[PDB]
Amino acid sequence: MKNDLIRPNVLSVKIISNVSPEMAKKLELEPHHKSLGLITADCDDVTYTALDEATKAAEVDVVYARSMYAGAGNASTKLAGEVIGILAGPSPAEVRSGLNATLDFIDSGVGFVSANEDDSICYYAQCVSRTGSYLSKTAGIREGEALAYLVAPPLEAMYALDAALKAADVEMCEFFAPPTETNFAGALLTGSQSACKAACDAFAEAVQSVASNPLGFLEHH
Amino acid sequence: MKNDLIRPNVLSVKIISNVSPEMAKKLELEPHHKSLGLITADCDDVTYTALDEATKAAEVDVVYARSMYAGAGNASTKLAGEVIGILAGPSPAEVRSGLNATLDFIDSGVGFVSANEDDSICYYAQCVSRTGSYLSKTAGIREGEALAYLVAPPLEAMYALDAALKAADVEMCEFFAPPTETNFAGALLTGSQSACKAACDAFAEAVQSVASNPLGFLEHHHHHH
Amino acid sequence: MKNDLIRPNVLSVKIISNVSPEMAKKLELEPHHKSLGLITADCDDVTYTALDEATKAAEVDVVYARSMYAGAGNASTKLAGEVIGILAGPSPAEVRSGLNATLDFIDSGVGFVSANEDDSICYYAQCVSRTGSYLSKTAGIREGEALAYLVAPPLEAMYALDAALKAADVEMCEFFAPPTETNFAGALLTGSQSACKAACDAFAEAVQSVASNPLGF
Ligand code: NA
Ligand code: NA
Ligand code: NA
């Protein structure tokens, strides 16, 4: 029902202890990337946020992070989910530490939230108070600056992004043009922690507004 | 069943007044674009045709038009359908007028056509007798010129496109290489109205022919294997 | 169940004779490509292997070969499957020969193998002893060289490629970065036929290992 958290789930986790040079080449790794941590889950944006959190907790870089076509509900195999993430670090111990931080964050209460009675519309509106080394780079901001991480289905996202931008003192960083692989859309916006939180609140409100009135457009503008 | 029209459905429609400069930039809008009309539906090519109609009815441009991966039957949320379209105009009034024209066209009786008993194969063979700004620009022809808008699943489409091109005095404008996001394929062909209709007729016939006998090759040529 | 072969199925086959100039141009055909053989199936990598085999069996080139988004189980129509392949040649006779060879190979016993009780995890580990003109190009290697053709779901594939590369003297020529259109991953590896076989065996074992213990790290 509306405002319920949709629980994200990790499906598989593995460590490669001493990456082969052939694999290092195709993943475009640097020489100090000796060990890899592999993870899949059924929620991509939560996992991306968690991978970024891991870079704050351990000496790991996010070296690979991609979503699956048509989302976790359409996975054809058990462990594909809708995301694969790869952390790289100097040793198995450090990669293990990073993976543990990733897992803890995924299970921490973050997640997409339902906008209606049967949870057929959902969105993500997460305030990242202090970015790690992954989301800061992707957003084009200094490490440690804040983001509003906003995701919703295509129309809801475009409508709600506009609402968030008008409501909150933030700047556009990365635009997720619809469709992403999972057929969602959204953006990373930056500003003060306060402004990012305001953007999240306005985004959530606007997505809920569309869910409650999906075809309505005739009112005075 | 075969030859049934598959009804297309609009899922969501909204307007953005005074688009933010941040969004205007990411959508690569013209400076005079001040308002946006957003629409989603469960059938992409009908919606694209409808958005083209909108550009004839009101002062709007189609500035965004994308299909969803694996089509409407695989949507994971209620309003995603398989298409998002965005109209841009100088005012909410114009965008409103454009959206109303889009909606009316989608519910005008157009749609994909079934090629078999359980509607598990379908195709689109629409003669656009008078293109608006959107499809004419997409096809590289003059506004008002005609198109054959031909869509089918990958193999049917390749087979039927060849049939359509042979049957009619038309020219290739845009090729939809398989897969599009929805795992279909096809093309926009241009020519006289009668030529575009002949291309549509031939395309439809060829798609139905494949649906009726997709593996006739096996008996005719793969015997004794 | 585990180690079961997942049968690959062909869904449609058609020929085009005297391809129209307009289609020839959009498909980037060569002047001698007058005829096309079209095929769809519910298993892309088996089909790609079969199309390559066809180039050794007939005077045909693989001119088009693409997978469908989200795989055959998510097809919205009956004949889309998860792959379309197009062979081109000088005559209907040659493209029919090429299609016949493609069909024979698809039915030869090759295919994805299940790694668990409900076949919810599967993989492809096929040694191609002698490449034809299609997989040699995609791999960026010399025609006639051997390949290991390795495919699995994303994490399993990354884990098992590591195991494969360590198991024998092979190079990774083409990386199928996750996701492919079907949400799988893997690679073409090359080396001696014996090394490629060793890589296939190591890949298969590693995928099975992950399936038996998905969360153990
Ligand atoms: Na603002
Ligand atoms: Na002609
Ligand atoms: Na599905």
XYZ file of C-alpha atoms and ligand atoms in Angstrom:
666
model
C 0.000 0.000 0.000
C 0.962 3.643 -0.340
C 4.128 4.622 1.554
C 5.219 1.014 2.118
C 8.898 0.351 1.676
C 9.651 -2.162 -1.047
C 12.352 -4.352 0.497
C 15.469 -4.800 -1.671
C 17.163 -8.207 -1.763
C 20.703 -9.331 -2.487
C 20.823 -12.469 -4.641
C 24.516 -13.396 -4.965
C 27.902 -12.269 -3.630
C 31.363 -13.628 -4.574
C 35.019 -12.639 -4.325
C 37.736 -13.074 -6.921
C 40.970 -13.084 -4.921
C 43.612 -12.464 -7.620
C 42.065 -11.203 -10.846
C 43.525 -12.603 -14.064
C 45.314 -10.120 -16.323
C 42.981 -10.964 -19.226
C 39.935 -9.996 -17.136
C 41.683 -6.920 -15.741
C 42.231 -5.741 -19.308
C 38.599 -6.058 -20.436
C 37.336 -4.424 -17.214
C 39.882 -1.647 -17.706
C 41.248 -2.116 -14.181
C 44.302 -0.323 -12.828
C 47.354 -2.278 -11.663
C 46.528 -1.971 -7.950
C 43.091 -3.565 -8.414
C 44.001 -7.106 -7.315
C 40.745 -8.466 -5.882
C 37.126 -8.139 -7.035
C 33.861 -8.274 -5.104
C 30.848 -9.316 -7.196
C 27.239 -8.605 -6.218
C 23.771 -8.914 -7.722
C 20.442 -7.798 -6.279
C 16.825 -7.183 -7.274
C 17.013 -3.388 -6.972
C 19.573 -1.450 -8.997
C 19.456 2.051 -7.517
C 19.614 0.862 -3.923
C 22.621 -1.245 -4.879
C 24.343 1.682 -6.621
C 23.846 3.777 -3.475
C 25.228 0.927 -1.343
C 28.286 0.458 -3.575
C 29.035 4.170 -3.148
C 28.641 3.780 0.610
C 31.180 0.928 0.503
C 33.849 3.228 -0.974
C 33.533 5.359 2.163
C 34.021 2.376 4.472
C 36.887 0.532 2.787
C 39.606 0.921 0.173
C 37.496 -0.205 -2.764
C 36.560 1.448 -6.056
C 33.331 0.772 -7.943
C 34.710 -0.510 -11.251
C 31.542 -1.966 -12.817
C 27.872 -1.218 -12.278
C 25.102 -2.057 -14.761
C 21.344 -2.687 -14.747
C 19.380 -5.503 -16.464
C 16.860 -4.997 -19.260
C 13.223 -4.872 -18.111
C 13.972 -5.138 -14.382
C 14.131 -7.861 -11.745
C 10.569 -9.099 -12.263
C 11.514 -10.104 -15.792
C 14.796 -11.818 -14.913
C 15.038 -15.180 -16.676
C 17.528 -16.650 -14.188
C 17.732 -16.881 -10.417
C 20.730 -14.638 -9.662
C 20.597 -12.000 -12.431
C 18.166 -9.746 -10.535
C 18.421 -6.306 -12.146
C 21.950 -5.198 -11.235
C 25.537 -6.367 -11.171
C 28.120 -4.435 -9.188
C 31.874 -4.986 -9.000
C 34.124 -3.536 -6.317
C 37.886 -3.614 -6.766
C 40.432 -3.445 -3.975
C 44.008 -4.320 -2.966
C 43.152 -7.574 -1.208
C 40.352 -10.021 -0.428
C 40.092 -8.670 3.136
C 39.489 -5.130 1.951
C 37.027 -6.272 -0.710
C 35.233 -8.318 1.933
C 34.984 -5.220 4.156
C 33.511 -3.248 1.269
C 31.005 -5.970 0.420
C 29.910 -6.155 4.071
C 29.321 -2.385 4.039
C 27.344 -2.766 0.783
C 25.176 -5.533 2.300
C 24.581 -3.568 5.499
C 23.476 -0.519 3.525
C 21.121 -2.533 1.318
C 19.463 -3.942 4.475
C 19.430 -0.611 6.300
C 15.881 0.537 5.536
C 16.520 2.340 2.256
C 14.433 1.409 -0.766
C 11.820 2.278 -3.327
C 8.520 3.364 -1.831
C 5.016 2.516 -3.042
C 2.836 5.315 -4.427
C -0.467 3.389 -4.515
C -2.637 0.643 -3.054
C -1.225 -2.287 -5.042
C 2.372 -1.030 -5.207
C 2.192 -0.836 -9.007
C 3.847 2.577 -8.950
C 6.995 3.141 -6.891
C 9.863 5.585 -6.624
C 13.236 6.227 -5.001
C 13.982 9.537 -3.335
C 17.166 9.103 -1.355
C 19.263 11.878 0.136
C 22.942 10.923 0.031
C 24.366 13.312 2.607
C 28.019 12.613 1.804
C 28.927 10.914 -1.467
C 31.651 8.339 -1.735
C 33.965 8.016 -4.709
C 31.433 6.429 -7.086
C 28.383 8.708 -7.131
C 30.489 11.869 -6.791
C 32.350 10.906 -9.973
C 29.205 9.944 -11.850
C 27.499 13.191 -10.817
C 30.570 15.331 -11.563
C 30.882 16.796 -8.075
C 33.482 16.804 -5.311
C 33.716 13.708 -3.203
C 31.676 14.203 -0.058
C 29.086 16.574 -1.484
C 25.394 15.670 -1.214
C 22.943 14.260 -3.750
C 19.257 13.733 -4.152
C 18.991 10.374 -5.918
C 15.600 10.476 -7.622
C 14.066 7.636 -9.645
C 10.539 6.887 -10.888
C 8.775 5.460 -13.945
C 9.163 7.602 -17.107
C 6.356 10.156 -16.970
C 6.279 10.366 -13.186
C 10.018 11.034 -13.175
C 9.896 13.871 -15.703
C 6.943 15.541 -13.930
C 8.439 15.023 -10.453
C 11.940 16.171 -11.433
C 10.459 19.441 -12.568
C 8.642 19.719 -9.229
C 11.822 18.922 -7.280
C 13.871 21.471 -9.221
C 11.300 24.189 -8.564
C 10.913 23.340 -4.875
C 14.508 22.803 -3.794
C 17.740 24.787 -4.124
C 19.575 22.143 -6.187
C 21.470 21.720 -9.478
C 21.083 19.048 -12.146
C 23.997 16.611 -12.394
C 23.197 13.303 -14.106
C 19.939 12.820 -16.046
C 18.627 9.265 -16.372
C 16.748 9.629 -19.663
C 13.812 7.208 -20.063
C 14.174 4.332 -20.494
C 17.004 3.180 -18.298
C 17.539 -0.578 -18.735
C 14.810 -1.170 -16.122
C 12.409 1.277 -17.833
C 12.691 3.916 -15.160
C 14.084 7.478 -15.234
C 15.216 10.223 -12.890
C 18.316 12.185 -11.959
C 21.087 12.925 -9.528
C 20.714 16.487 -8.213
C 23.186 18.229 -5.917
C 23.080 20.977 -3.319
C 23.206 21.347 0.451
C 21.998 18.366 2.461
C 18.939 20.471 3.283
C 18.225 21.200 -0.373
C 18.703 17.568 -1.401
C 16.238 16.476 1.292
C 13.741 19.097 0.075
C 14.145 17.771 -3.479
C 13.451 14.234 -2.283
C 10.293 15.346 -0.476
C 8.986 17.305 -3.487
C 9.841 14.452 -5.877
C 7.989 11.911 -3.723
C 4.965 14.206 -3.407
C 4.810 14.738 -7.175
C 5.062 11.022 -8.021
C 2.214 10.336 -5.589
C 0.197 13.136 -7.233
C 0.520 11.485 -10.663
C -0.399 8.079 -9.266
C -3.568 9.599 -7.782
C -4.457 11.451 -10.991
C -2.687 9.868 -13.938
C -4.763 11.287 -16.801
C -5.581 14.761 -15.422
C -4.066 17.713 -17.312
C -6.818 20.258 -18.012
C -6.535 22.449 -14.915
C -5.397 26.071 -15.239
C -1.627 26.408 -15.555
C -8.281 -13.571 -33.817
C -6.800 -12.772 -37.228
C -7.503 -9.254 -38.579
C -8.793 -8.027 -35.204
C -7.673 -4.539 -34.262
C -5.666 -4.471 -31.037
C -6.917 -1.506 -29.048
C -4.183 0.900 -27.910
C -4.525 2.530 -24.493
C -3.229 5.799 -23.054
C -1.955 5.393 -19.469
C -0.894 8.855 -18.307
C -0.914 12.476 -19.497
C 0.477 15.534 -17.705
C 1.604 19.093 -18.406
C 4.637 20.991 -17.157
C 4.176 24.767 -17.237
C 7.246 26.978 -17.348
C 9.753 24.166 -17.694
C 12.776 24.559 -15.449
C 15.993 25.637 -17.187
C 17.693 22.523 -15.817
C 15.227 20.187 -17.554
C 15.133 22.351 -20.665
C 18.886 21.831 -20.974
C 18.838 18.041 -20.509
C 15.973 17.717 -23.017
C 17.809 19.990 -25.463
C 14.790 22.278 -25.867
C 14.621 25.377 -28.049
C 14.487 28.690 -26.154
C 10.875 29.275 -27.200
C 9.784 25.950 -25.678
C 8.254 27.011 -22.366
C 5.823 24.185 -21.635
C 5.823 20.400 -21.979
C 3.094 17.835 -22.525
C 3.912 14.327 -21.314
C 2.172 11.115 -22.413
C 2.571 7.364 -21.973
C 0.615 4.536 -23.570
C 0.757 0.777 -24.152
C 1.523 0.947 -27.892
C 4.518 2.883 -29.150
C 4.017 3.238 -32.886
C 0.364 4.300 -32.541
C 1.535 6.917 -30.063
C 4.282 8.175 -32.387
C 1.716 8.500 -35.176
C -0.584 10.362 -32.771
C 2.201 12.743 -31.717
C 2.756 13.531 -35.379
C -0.955 14.349 -35.633
C -0.525 16.700 -32.668
C 2.080 18.721 -34.602
C -0.583 19.399 -37.255
C -3.223 20.458 -34.705
C -1.298 22.853 -32.465
C 1.886 24.852 -32.033
C 3.948 21.978 -30.637
C 7.085 20.039 -31.532
C 7.814 16.419 -30.602
C 10.980 16.768 -28.512
C 11.136 13.314 -26.913
C 9.916 9.927 -28.103
C 11.241 6.642 -26.739
C 10.029 3.052 -26.396
C 10.431 0.762 -23.366
C 12.529 -2.417 -23.306
C 10.531 -5.615 -23.964
C 7.216 -3.838 -24.546
C 4.083 -3.032 -22.589
C 3.352 -6.618 -21.553
C 6.620 -6.568 -19.625
C 6.160 -3.211 -17.883
C 6.883 -3.461 -14.166
C 4.844 -0.360 -13.204
C 1.337 0.854 -14.061
C 2.057 3.937 -16.184
C 5.282 3.006 -17.986
C 3.523 1.174 -20.810
C 5.947 0.980 -23.728
C 6.302 4.617 -24.780
C 6.929 8.103 -23.467
C 6.294 11.103 -25.678
C 6.969 14.760 -24.926
C 5.481 17.688 -26.772
C 6.932 21.168 -26.356
C 5.226 24.473 -27.116
C 5.238 28.164 -26.177
C 2.416 27.953 -23.641
C 0.356 25.495 -21.637
C -2.604 26.253 -23.925
C -0.768 25.014 -27.024
C 0.555 21.925 -25.270
C -2.951 21.214 -23.997
C -4.278 21.468 -27.557
C -1.524 19.150 -28.801
C -2.226 16.565 -26.088
C -5.951 16.580 -26.799
C -5.233 15.890 -30.494
C -2.855 13.065 -29.500
C -5.407 11.466 -27.216
C -8.172 11.703 -29.814
C -5.970 10.078 -32.435
C -4.969 7.193 -30.196
C -8.656 6.473 -29.621
C -9.626 6.977 -33.276
C -9.715 3.314 -34.328
C -6.056 2.910 -35.211
C -4.007 0.029 -33.862
C -1.851 -2.975 -34.584
C -3.643 -5.796 -36.369
C -3.600 -9.436 -35.314
C -2.192 -12.043 -37.694
C -3.401 -15.187 -35.892
C -5.991 -16.830 -33.652
C -4.553 -15.813 -30.270
C -3.139 -12.467 -31.400
C 0.396 -13.693 -30.643
C 1.640 -12.133 -33.879
C 0.637 -8.602 -34.814
C 1.735 -5.813 -37.135
C 1.158 -2.173 -38.055
C 0.650 -1.107 -41.663
C -0.527 2.478 -41.452
C -0.711 4.878 -44.350
C 0.090 8.358 -43.019
C -1.530 10.345 -45.802
C -0.306 13.735 -44.574
C 2.765 13.862 -42.319
C 3.209 16.527 -39.670
C 6.543 17.982 -38.599
C 7.589 15.006 -36.495
C 7.414 12.087 -38.938
C 8.378 14.194 -41.934
C 11.584 15.244 -40.121
C 12.181 11.665 -38.979
C 11.782 10.384 -42.559
C 13.593 13.299 -44.221
C 10.659 14.220 -46.464
C 8.648 17.403 -46.883
C 5.868 18.114 -44.428
C 2.548 16.870 -45.756
C 4.050 14.037 -47.802
C 2.763 10.495 -47.300
C 4.364 7.538 -45.508
C 3.852 3.854 -45.140
C 4.543 3.152 -41.453
C 5.355 -0.544 -41.325
C 6.063 -2.517 -38.138
C 6.196 -6.235 -37.349
C 8.254 -8.717 -35.325
C 11.842 -9.160 -36.549
C 11.687 -11.891 -39.225
C 8.184 -11.022 -40.445
C 9.315 -7.409 -40.773
C 12.401 -8.157 -42.869
C 10.453 -10.503 -45.140
C 7.469 -8.174 -45.491
C 9.576 -5.025 -46.016
C 11.191 -6.672 -49.024
C 7.717 -7.562 -50.330
C 6.440 -4.014 -49.774
C 9.402 -2.419 -51.567
C 8.960 -4.717 -54.561
C 5.200 -4.166 -54.769
C 5.076 -0.386 -54.694
C 6.855 2.683 -56.053
C 8.151 3.775 -52.651
C 11.498 4.812 -51.168
C 13.147 3.812 -47.922
C 13.340 6.653 -45.384
C 13.993 5.184 -41.916
C 14.843 1.543 -41.157
C 13.920 0.157 -37.710
C 16.587 -2.516 -37.330
C 15.577 -5.513 -35.193
C 15.322 -5.234 -32.252
C 13.761 -1.909 -31.427
C 13.310 -1.599 -27.650
C 10.023 -3.533 -27.921
C 11.660 -6.270 -30.044
C 9.925 -5.224 -33.268
C 11.296 -3.881 -36.575
C 10.130 -2.238 -39.773
C 10.489 1.005 -41.671
C 9.044 4.267 -42.871
C 8.620 4.278 -46.653
C 7.535 7.257 -48.786
C 5.846 7.793 -52.140
C 2.461 8.828 -53.506
C -0.594 8.087 -51.366
C -1.553 5.183 -53.629
C 2.001 3.827 -53.521
C 2.141 4.004 -49.721
C -1.205 2.185 -49.533
C 0.083 -0.496 -51.930
C 3.141 -0.895 -49.697
C 0.923 -1.214 -46.617
C -1.253 -3.822 -48.329
C 1.750 -5.894 -49.434
C 3.440 -5.646 -46.025
C 0.289 -6.825 -44.261
C -0.142 -9.738 -46.663
C 3.489 -10.820 -46.267
C 3.375 -10.678 -42.453
C 0.195 -12.771 -42.470
C 1.870 -15.250 -44.831
C 4.742 -15.814 -42.423
C 2.403 -16.142 -39.457
C 0.330 -18.746 -41.303
C 3.364 -20.847 -42.252
C 6.539 -19.926 -40.357
C 8.359 -23.248 -40.933
C 7.276 -24.460 -44.382
C 11.005 -24.519 -45.135
C 11.405 -27.663 -43.041
C 9.290 -29.919 -45.245
C 10.226 -28.273 -48.546
C 13.980 -28.089 -48.048
C 15.129 -29.743 -44.795
C 13.820 -33.229 -45.577
C 16.192 -36.196 -45.176
C 18.229 -34.393 -42.500
C 17.504 -30.663 -13.365
C 21.257 -30.125 -13.048
C 23.252 -31.152 -16.150
C 20.114 -31.382 -18.299
C 20.472 -29.995 -21.796
C 18.075 -27.161 -22.512
C 16.818 -27.861 -26.021
C 17.179 -24.923 -28.425
C 14.213 -24.355 -30.770
C 13.874 -22.734 -34.185
C 10.714 -20.653 -34.559
C 10.740 -19.385 -38.155
C 12.750 -19.612 -41.371
C 12.259 -17.685 -44.638
C 14.152 -16.895 -47.824
C 14.425 -13.652 -49.786
C 15.394 -13.996 -53.456
C 16.676 -10.974 -55.415
C 16.810 -8.733 -52.365
C 15.547 -5.212 -53.056
C 18.294 -2.569 -53.454
C 16.809 -0.555 -50.612
C 17.119 -3.448 -48.151
C 20.552 -4.366 -49.490
C 21.747 -0.872 -48.674
C 20.305 -0.796 -45.153
C 21.768 -4.236 -44.399
C 25.096 -3.131 -45.914
C 25.223 -6.111 -48.277
C 27.988 -6.796 -50.784
C 27.221 -6.821 -54.530
C 27.262 -10.621 -54.715
C 24.658 -10.936 -51.947
C 21.504 -11.526 -54.000
C 19.654 -13.879 -51.627
C 18.978 -13.866 -47.871
C 18.172 -16.664 -45.445
C 16.308 -15.512 -42.322
C 15.978 -17.458 -39.067
C 14.670 -16.895 -35.521
C 15.088 -19.132 -32.508
C 14.681 -19.156 -28.738
C 18.398 -19.418 -27.945
C 20.740 -16.740 -29.229
C 24.247 -18.101 -28.584
C 23.453 -21.548 -29.971
C 22.113 -19.819 -33.068
C 25.249 -17.641 -33.387
C 27.388 -20.765 -33.195
C 25.177 -22.437 -35.806
C 25.364 -19.462 -38.182
C 29.155 -19.571 -37.965
C 29.032 -23.299 -38.725
C 26.876 -22.487 -41.766
C 29.699 -20.358 -43.240
C 31.817 -23.525 -43.369
C 28.993 -25.531 -44.947
C 27.868 -23.130 -47.676
C 28.817 -20.083 -49.698
C 27.161 -17.683 -47.296
C 28.142 -14.813 -44.997
C 26.478 -13.896 -41.730
C 25.297 -10.348 -42.488
C 22.992 -9.705 -39.519
C 22.688 -11.321 -36.106
C 21.064 -9.692 -33.068
C 19.517 -10.762 -29.760
C 16.153 -9.641 -28.291
C 15.799 -7.584 -25.112
C 15.077 -9.648 -21.970
C 15.315 -13.012 -23.723
C 12.978 -15.563 -25.214
C 10.864 -16.021 -22.085
C 9.868 -12.355 -22.343
C 9.050 -12.373 -26.063
C 5.756 -10.603 -26.734
C 5.171 -12.363 -30.072
C 5.372 -15.966 -31.248
C 8.260 -15.835 -33.728
C 10.543 -13.200 -32.182
C 12.281 -15.663 -29.862
C 15.523 -14.083 -28.695
C 17.547 -13.981 -31.909
C 17.330 -13.080 -35.562
C 20.005 -14.268 -37.956
C 20.448 -13.447 -41.624
C 22.650 -15.334 -44.061
C 23.452 -13.826 -47.456
C 24.664 -15.584 -50.585
C 24.622 -15.531 -54.397
C 21.515 -17.703 -54.911
C 18.562 -19.277 -53.154
C 20.419 -22.594 -53.437
C 23.314 -21.374 -51.304
C 21.181 -19.672 -48.656
C 18.976 -22.777 -48.377
C 22.162 -24.832 -47.932
C 23.355 -22.378 -45.271
C 20.002 -22.538 -43.460
C 20.017 -26.331 -43.625
C 23.464 -26.392 -41.993
C 22.320 -23.878 -39.349
C 19.326 -26.076 -38.559
C 21.446 -29.251 -38.371
C 23.823 -27.617 -35.894
C 21.031 -26.240 -33.701
C 19.617 -29.787 -33.519
C 23.035 -31.426 -33.006
C 22.967 -31.674 -29.200
C 24.665 -28.370 -28.420
C 22.926 -26.038 -25.988
C 22.769 -24.396 -22.606
C 23.119 -26.732 -19.646
C 21.210 -26.471 -16.369
C 23.192 -25.848 -13.188
C 20.360 -26.555 -10.733
C 17.197 -28.464 -9.902
C 14.706 -26.101 -11.578
C 16.944 -25.046 -14.465
C 16.792 -21.466 -13.169
C 20.535 -21.115 -13.696
C 22.061 -22.294 -16.971
C 25.243 -21.791 -18.977
C 26.860 -22.377 -22.365
C 30.372 -23.779 -22.582
C 30.995 -24.747 -26.194
C 34.373 -25.472 -27.762
C 34.386 -24.375 -31.388
C 37.242 -26.444 -32.854
C 37.457 -24.444 -36.094
C 35.819 -21.039 -36.511
C 34.047 -20.036 -39.672
C 33.920 -16.470 -40.956
C 31.449 -15.068 -38.412
C 32.791 -15.835 -34.916
C 36.346 -15.232 -36.120
C 35.336 -11.673 -37.020
C 33.421 -10.952 -33.838
C 36.381 -12.252 -31.823
C 38.942 -10.311 -33.864
C 40.983 -13.447 -34.528
C 42.164 -15.354 -37.575
C 39.604 -17.477 -39.385
C 39.969 -21.171 -38.543
C 41.315 -20.691 -35.013
C 39.560 -22.404 -32.078
C 37.316 -20.732 -29.492
C 35.733 -21.374 -26.148
C 32.240 -19.829 -26.277
C 31.283 -19.152 -22.671
C 27.956 -17.676 -21.495
C 26.196 -17.478 -18.120
C 24.161 -15.016 -16.061
C 26.110 -11.910 -14.996
C 27.765 -12.804 -11.685
C 28.231 -16.478 -12.518
C 29.841 -15.466 -15.798
C 32.346 -13.066 -14.212
C 33.271 -15.616 -11.556
C 33.525 -18.483 -14.026
C 35.479 -16.489 -16.632
C 38.102 -15.933 -13.945
C 38.254 -19.682 -13.351
C 38.416 -20.377 -17.106
C 41.249 -17.921 -17.722
C 43.267 -19.464 -14.897
C 42.630 -23.027 -16.057
C 44.419 -22.897 -19.413
C 46.514 -20.767 -21.743
C 43.740 -18.744 -23.368
C 43.153 -15.095 -24.275
C 39.855 -13.251 -23.913
C 39.127 -11.972 -27.425
C 35.542 -10.763 -27.059
C 33.960 -9.847 -23.714
C 30.162 -9.997 -23.502
C 29.797 -7.298 -20.859
C 26.698 -7.731 -18.667
C 23.991 -7.188 -19.690
C 23.767 -8.625 -23.156
C 20.307 -8.002 -24.593
C 19.226 -11.248 -22.913
C 20.768 -10.235 -19.536
C 23.565 -12.774 -19.762
C 27.338 -12.311 -19.974
C 30.499 -14.176 -20.921
C 33.237 -14.205 -23.540
C 34.926 -15.768 -26.520
C 38.312 -17.123 -25.480
C 40.941 -18.436 -27.868
C 43.928 -20.773 -27.766
C 44.680 -24.348 -28.824
C 41.674 -26.652 -29.091
C 42.849 -28.416 -25.920
C 43.196 -25.152 -23.997
C 39.744 -24.030 -25.140
C 38.281 -27.340 -23.956
C 39.998 -26.963 -20.574
C 38.529 -23.470 -20.332
C 35.040 -24.774 -21.112
C 35.312 -27.416 -18.395
C 36.533 -24.907 -15.806
C 33.799 -22.415 -16.726
C 31.097 -25.066 -16.306
C 32.426 -26.176 -12.903
C 32.593 -22.590 -11.661
C 29.024 -21.729 -12.707
C 27.821 -24.866 -10.920
C 29.793 -23.789 -7.834
C 28.049 -20.412 -7.677
C 24.642 -22.009 -8.226
C 25.242 -24.336 -5.251
C 26.388 -21.492 -3.018
C 25.183 -18.102 -4.299
C 25.794 -16.056 -1.148
C 28.977 -17.666 0.191
C 31.951 -15.300 0.210
Na 15.549 25.299 -7.430
Na 11.399 -0.391 -57.317
Na 7.889 -10.920 -18.477
